[PDB]
Amino acid sequence: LRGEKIMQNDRGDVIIDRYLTLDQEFDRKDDDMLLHPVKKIIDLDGNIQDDPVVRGNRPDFTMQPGVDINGNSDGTVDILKGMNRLSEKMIMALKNEYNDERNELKIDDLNESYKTNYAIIHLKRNAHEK
Amino acid sequence: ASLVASIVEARKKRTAKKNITPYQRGIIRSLILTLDCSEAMLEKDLRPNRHAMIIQYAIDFVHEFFDQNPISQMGIIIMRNGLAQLVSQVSGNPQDHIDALKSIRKQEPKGNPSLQNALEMARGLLLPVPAHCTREVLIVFGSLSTTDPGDIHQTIDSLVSEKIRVKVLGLSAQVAICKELCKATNYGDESFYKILLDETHLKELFNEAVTPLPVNKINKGFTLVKMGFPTRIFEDTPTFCSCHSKLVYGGYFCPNCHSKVCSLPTVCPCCDLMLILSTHLARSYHHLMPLKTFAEVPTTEKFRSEDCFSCQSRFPILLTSSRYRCEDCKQEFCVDCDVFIHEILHNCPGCESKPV
Amino acid sequence: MKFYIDDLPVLFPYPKIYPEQYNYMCDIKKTLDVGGNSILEMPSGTGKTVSLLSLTIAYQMHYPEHRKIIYCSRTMSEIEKALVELENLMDYRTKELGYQEDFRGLGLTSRKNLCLHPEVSKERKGTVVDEKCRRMTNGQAKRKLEEDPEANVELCEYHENLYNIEVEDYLPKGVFSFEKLLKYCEEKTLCPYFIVRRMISLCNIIIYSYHYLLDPKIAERVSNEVSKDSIVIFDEAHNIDNVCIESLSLDLTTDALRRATRGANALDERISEVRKVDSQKLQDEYEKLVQGLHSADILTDQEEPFVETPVLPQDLLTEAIPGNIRRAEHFVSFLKRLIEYLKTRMKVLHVISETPKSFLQHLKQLTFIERKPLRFCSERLSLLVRTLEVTEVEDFTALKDIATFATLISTYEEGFLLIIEPYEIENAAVPNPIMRFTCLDASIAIKPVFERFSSVIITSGTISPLDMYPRMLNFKTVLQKSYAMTLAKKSFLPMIITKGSDQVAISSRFEIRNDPSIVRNYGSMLVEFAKITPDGMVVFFPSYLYMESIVSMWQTMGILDEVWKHKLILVETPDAQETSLALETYRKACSNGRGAILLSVARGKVSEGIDFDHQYGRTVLMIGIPFQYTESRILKARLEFMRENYRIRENDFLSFDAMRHAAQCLGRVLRGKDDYGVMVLADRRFSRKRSQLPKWIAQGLSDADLNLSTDMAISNTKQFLRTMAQPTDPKDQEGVSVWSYEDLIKHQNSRK
Ligand code: SF4
Ligand SMILES: [Zn+2]
Ligand SMILES: [Zn+2]
Ligand SMILES: [Zn+2]
Ligand SMILES: [Zn+2]
């Protein structure tokens, strides 16, 4: 849970270890809780799917997740997802029960400078003597 | 050229002061002073530390705020341990706020700041305020990050709906939320988010906030406020006060219920009627009829007199004329008087001297 | 405003205009009037797309020619941004001219990005989506339903509804973005994909990615509809060579060959099954093949070939079938032997690099497969597959790779090299041999583009040096220049860090990635910068593996724990959907004010189109020069080819390749002149790379920032951030960095 690579040598606790499999189910449930359609502006999924028939040389091992001698993942990518999931949960928790793209793309600096709309009062001075 | 260098700098400084028009200003104010006391405030950029200097300047701000706004009320909030702490109820007594700040000067700051918590508390504290008052919030932010339990955007929208105004003074750099909070809350104006550039510059920013803020044309609310003018009475024997219930030599007598009070200006505890003196309103008059700035007289023309009209100071002969004239009355003045007449006094002696 | 050029009126969509934009427009008009190619480099802090569109649109509307416009980008996300500018641009023209002029502009993308079918848009791969869409849109289902209504084959309501209305009435006049196009199509039950494809010939401006103009697999169909005299714009083309090379590249693994034999056997079995019951189809196909017809004359417009032409249209032979692969059974035997030949070449014990001619010669020796029959493997397969009634093609999918390999190797012989490696990953218990067909010349796939179109503009924010691109890609330019922003007050602070707070040199060399001294120095840099960065911080690493290893080292050391206090940590992941969620969270965290730091890869998905304007990007930490993996056969072959052909030194190209990516990320932080940020390059090797950086970035790099320390750099950043926060004096930018209409007229008078 602390986002640290689990070590097989570590003995751990027998009782708590029973819930490790449950956490894997919880992470899958949490992943759906965060999954939702993303705006096309920052939609990285479509960038790779823009040309679905791209055929090219496979990327070198430096551009792919690290793997061990046996070929399986070393597991350090999992903690990255764990940390990434943790950050997403915190932001989502903020948005509890308690057009836009066009505006963002426009350059504000090129627009007319803001003009103050303060009021002006002129007071006449005249009154009867005491 | 060295002497001319000072002169041209004065002209540049006077350039901003040229544009002065009688903007409508809300004399009656309700201020919620928010101070940031978090781990980020333990830095040494401000000697001895940010917390010590901010508290020290806060005391000066309290003294200045009530001096020029006698009919205003203020409240103090502080952010500590990611929570908003209330240290003084909204009141018209300057001594109460100063005493609270002095006690705060001892406790060390710790924890993280929470703008949403502070703003939410300010919104509640300003709920029981008359509609004729101007609701203002002075926030001193030093941290570059904010930890909040809820959505800050919703609170900002609520602040706009409540016609609240927020002024933020930063310490290190610009914060996205602070700019948005100061922009959306001030009708898109971007001049309400200020970042200090050195120790001295901070003093000016605090002093600037004293002056009442101009009101927006669309946000126009006109109403008549019922008030009273008690008559001071001297008593031979001490009597109980209606506010603190303690023995005092004497106090002002309310004209609506005859109940006595200790100090002015305050709302009568019995009839809830604001009690003031003629002097209290008189001070805020200069904000309603600001004195038109004096324009320097070019050396090409011929001067009227060799000495100042108001102080009889011989004008030095020395390139640039050391005389400033008033358009309304056409009377030359020395540099010293103009500063004194526009910062201490608020009436041009030349205009008054002219008969009609 | 609406200002005038020598003879062209242009309507700028803003009341103000930057001096650079006016110079940008004037030069572009000069290029269009004179004809030819040009290369233009602008600072990222000035509106480039809006300025480019305003002039180009006006050029089409004013001159009688009314030449169409082709806009090319590098990613789908860029298409969306370009369309938004066009939509904003058209709104201004409609409001100023008093009417909506006749204009049509649509974006383009794959089916996966525009499919509305409830049961086909829920797929994780575009290949399956295309197959399912083809099945319901090939025409077999429609024809079968007409003959027998009882047939259970289904159709697509979105596709069917289009037949009711004419092509000219698919969409109303105007500009439709993907966000708007989907909404309009959803309300009327229409397919945006088919609407876009059938309206290219009618659209005034068409916007699509580079893959739709350089890749023969998908460009041929699109290119056949656009005009020949249309304007071509290459937006953000500073990495065009990489896109060009991958267009004519292929990979073959042992598993692919293993699955190819199963498909070949299945194909043979299918032929026998069809032969027993329905042998007329084979004879009908054979009869057409004898005369010399091809897929174009046989396949209908509604349907598409199973195997996309892997070679350019100009390089495919127009001769009839040789005869060896004229029959279904004979072709399968030809295909089967080819697969076995590849398998036996996969047992080599050391790296082998041979030219296509050498591979063909050995093939002609061991077996008797000639060059000419090998070129029609893809062409013949599509005909056989179509006539075999193979509606389910799950087994035959693997054969596409084999057909693609045969056509490519048998077509081109110069500039292409074939690499066979016994170990795809050196860190593997058991060998996993791979076979790679690499493309060395970067001008082969772009040559047709530069010949078909007369005027082409190549523009980008960090395209430097400008002299190299004409050398790498064989084309000539009438003019090539880079504009320097005339910002009144410095807005970006580029600095180079060569050592840490301990005065120890810091570098991102792969061999010393697990260096206890360097890791701490970089960790200290990350934490210190995160303490002063107000809202957002982006960290770019040379490669995912280096980032993956170093981040793990920080986690154990506890450096991340300190960062968690000040900002949220978002990490790029190989999965595209997860990375997209990270950006949304990163943007959300920056917006509210919680603060967030994003760790990404300089060559990753974030750096190829995602922008970090204003609050999102306030400090950029380039962790090391993004050098490629030197010990790579693909790169080494490319380096040698350039040195012998274009006389470009291997070191020079390697430095250029890394700088072009490091600069790319630097330009994704400034949008206007009101934006500010600090660009720190943490490596001792950046000190000598100042000349290689973009001109607009180099000019802002002071001589004292070439070699800085962590402590010294932090202080400079703190001072810069504080100073920029102060209100800017309007008079300091009234007519020196920002121009009003009156200021623009004055410039037009003094210049004239
Ligand atoms: S026709 Fe359009 S909506 Fe139907 S499956 Fe194909 S892409 Fe999807
Ligand atoms: Zn009392
Ligand atoms: Zn009373
Ligand atoms: Zn005087
Ligand atoms: Zn006067």
Swiss-Prot record, chain A:
Role, per record: Component of the general transcription and DNA repair factor IIH (TFIIH) core complex, which is involved in general and transcription-coupled nucleotide excision repair (NER) of damaged DNA and, when complexed to TFIIK, in RNA transcription by RNA polymerase II. In NER, TFIIH acts by opening DNA around the lesion to allow the excision of the damaged oligonucleotide and its replacement by a new DNA fragment. In transcription, TFIIH has an essential role in transcription initiation.
Cystine connections: none
Compartments, as annotated in UniProt: Nucleus
Remaining remarks: Present with 5150 molecules/cell in log phase SD medium.
Superkingdom of origin: Eukaryota
Name by which UniProt lists this protein: General transcription and DNA repair factor IIH subunit TFB1
Subunit structure: Component of the 7-subunit TFIIH core complex composed of XPB/SSL2, XPD/RAD3, SSL1, TFB1, TFB2, TFB4 and TFB5, which is active in NER. The core complex associates with the 3-subunit CTD-kinase module TFIIK composed of CCL1, KIN28 and TFB3 to form the 10-subunit holoenzyme (holo-TFIIH) active in transcription. An additionnal subunit, TFB6, plays a role in the dissociation of the SSL2 helicase from TFIIH after transcription initiation. TFB1 interacts with XPC/RAD4. XPC/RAD4 recruits TFIIH to the NER machinery. Interacts with the NER 3'-endonuclease XPG/RAD2.
Organism of provenance: Saccharomyces cerevisiae (strain ATCC 204508 / S288c)
Family assignment from sequence similarity: Belongs to the TFB1 family.
Curated annotation (Swiss-Prot), chain B:
Segments forming C4-type zinc fingers: 254-271
Location of this chain's protein in the cell: Nucleus
Key words, A-Z: DNA damage, DNA repair, Metal-binding, Nucleus, Transcription, Transcription regulation, Zinc, Zinc-finger
GO MF term set: ubiquitin protein ligase activity; zinc ion binding
Domain VWFA, first and last residues per copy: 30-209
Gene Ontology BP terms: nucleotide-excision repair; regulation of transcription by RNA polymerase II; transcription by RNA polymerase II; transcription initiation at RNA polymerase II promoter
Main location group: nucleus
GO cellular component: nucleotide-excision repair factor 3 complex; transcription factor TFIIH core complex; transcription factor TFIIH holo complex
Recorded superkingdom: Eukaryota
Note: Present with 2340 molecules/cell in log phase SD medium.
Family: Belongs to the GTF2H2 family.
Role noted for this protein: Component of the general transcription and DNA repair factor IIH (TFIIH) core complex, which is involved in general and transcription-coupled nucleotide excision repair (NER) of damaged DNA and, when complexed to TFIIK, in RNA transcription by RNA polymerase II. In NER, TFIIH acts by opening DNA around the lesion to allow the excision of the damaged oligonucleotide and its replacement by a new DNA fragment. In transcription, TFIIH has an essential role in transcription initiation.
Subunit structure: Component of the 7-subunit TFIIH core complex composed of XPB/SSL2, XPD/RAD3, SSL1, TFB1, TFB2, TFB4 and TFB5, which is active in NER. The core complex associates with the 3-subunit CTD-kinase module TFIIK composed of CCL1, KIN28 and TFB3 to form the 10-subunit holoenzyme (holo-TFIIH) active in transcription. An additionnal subunit, TFB6, plays a role in the dissociation of the SSL2 helicase from TFIIH after transcription initiation.
Protein name as annotated: General transcription and DNA repair factor IIH subunit SSL1
The organism of origin for this protein: Saccharomyces cerevisiae (strain ATCC 204508 / S288c)
Residues of the full protein shown: 96 to 459 of 461
From Swiss-Prot, chain C:
Residues covered by the Helicase ATP-binding domain: 7-285
Effect of residue 111 to H: Intermediate level of UV-sensitivity
Domain of life: Eukaryota
Names of the cofactor(s): [4Fe-4S] cluster; Mg(2+)
Location of this chain's protein in the cell: Nucleus
Iron-sulfur listed as a keyword: yes
Gene3D superfamilies given in the database record: 1.10.275.40, Bacterial XPD DNA helicase, FeS cluster domain (1.10.30.20), P-loop containing nucleotide triphosphate hydrolases (3.40.50.300)
UniProt motif DEAH box: location: 235-238
Gene Ontology molecular function terms on file: 4 iron, 4 sulfur cluster binding; 5'-3' DNA helicase activity; ATP binding; ATP hydrolysis activity; ATP-dependent activity, acting on DNA; damaged DNA binding; DNA helicase activity; metal ion binding
The protein, known as: General transcription and DNA repair factor IIH helicase subunit XPD/RAD3
Gene: RAD3
